[PDB]
Swiss-Prot record:
It comes from Gallus gallus. Substrate binds at D101. The lineage of its organism: Eukaryota, Metazoa, Chordata, Craniata, Vertebrata. One of its GO terms (biological process) is cell wall macromolecule catabolic process. This is Lysozyme C. Residues 1-129 form the C-type lysozyme domain. PROSITE patterns: GLYCOSYL_HYDROL_F22_1, GLYCOSYL_HYDROL_F22_2.
């Protein structure tokens, strides 16, 4: 599924991400924009052989099982395929674990490089929320 901007803002808010760990909804929308372009089926293979999955490009090294990332963990206790669903519940629940891990949203390199410190409220401007 390719979400619209305001459509994803609303889904993220419905699933409790707005101000989760102190990060406003615009931070989450921005991260999703640059990680996936709002596409649930986004995948990206890393040089280390791990894969990133879904709207927030969650990595198989720690967070999900894909059976092809040697030495990895599955801390969200999900198949990485669950992160590609039209239903963002698994992505959101797993994102709450990641952002709790100690480094906040710096876990998402694209958030650090493209969202952090910017006017992220622009990402939810105009949306009925
Ligand atoms: Cl957009
Ligand atoms: Cl915001
Ligand atoms: Cl594996
Ligand atoms: Cl594990
Ligand atoms: Cl699995
Ligand atoms: Cl959803
Ligand atoms: Cl933080
Ligand atoms: Na894994």
């Amino acid at each position: 599924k390719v979400f619209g901007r305001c459509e994803l803002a609303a889904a993220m808010k419905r699933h409790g991400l707005d101000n989760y760990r102190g990060y406003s909804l615009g931070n989450w929308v921005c991260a999703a924009k640059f990680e996936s372009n709002f596409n649930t089926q986004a995948t990206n293979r890393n040089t280390d052989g791990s894969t990133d999955y879904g709207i927030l490009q969650i990595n198989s090294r720690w967070w999900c099982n894909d059976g092809r990332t040697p030495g990895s963990r599955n801390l969200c206790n999900i198949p990485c395929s669950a992160l590609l669903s039209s239903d963002i519940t698994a992505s959101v629940n797993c994102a709450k674990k990641i952002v709790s891990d100690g480094n906040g949203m710096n876990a998402w390199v694209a958030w650090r490089n493209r969202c952090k410190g910017t006017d992220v409220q622009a990402w939810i401007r105009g949306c009925r929320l």
